[PDB]
Amino acid sequence: PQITLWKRPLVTIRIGGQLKEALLDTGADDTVLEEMNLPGKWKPKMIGGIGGFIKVRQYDQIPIEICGHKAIGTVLVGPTPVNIIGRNLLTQIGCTLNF
């Protein structure tokens, strides 16, 4: 699709068999989801945003369907204010900025 920006670019994603709402976030390097359970191994990591640093759980090679487009990649789980889809997965679904 083409998505304008008068409203937040929220989309439905499917991950671990669950539907969630997430924000397409070109300013995010990484994909960060609010607390949830995901299967398999994870690694403790830290990431920084506008307000400082948080601790997250890093899950690798996780499938995630974003507005019907398939990605498989790294998902960070932790105290983000909202679910954000970052550039690591935006690139996988072929997302560009255009003006």
Ligand X SMILES: CC[C@H](C)CN(C[C@@H](O)[C@H](Cc1ccccc1)NC(=O)O[C@H]1CO[C@H]2OCC[C@H]21)S(=O)(=O)c1ccc2ncsc2c1
Element (H, E) at 88: helix 87-90
* Contacts of a second copy in 27-66 (CB under 8 A): 27-29, 32, 47-54
Count of C-beta atoms within a 10 Å radius of residue 4: 6
CA–CA distance, 76 with 98 (Å, rounded to integer): 27
Nearer Cβ to ligand X, position 48 or 94? Answer: 48
- The distance in angstroms from the start CA to the end CA of the chain is 15
| Minimum separation from the CB atom of position 94 to a second copy (A) | 4
CA–CA distance, 36 with 58 (Å, rounded to integer): 12
Please choose which of ligand X, a second copy, none residue 54 contacts, taking the beta carbon within 5 to 8 angstroms, the exact cut-off set by kind: a second copy
| Minimum separation from the CB atom of position 73 to a second copy (A) | 13
Interface residues toward a second copy, by CB under 8 A: 1-6, 8-9, 23-29, 32, 47-54, 67, 69, 79-82, 84, 87, 90-91, 93-99
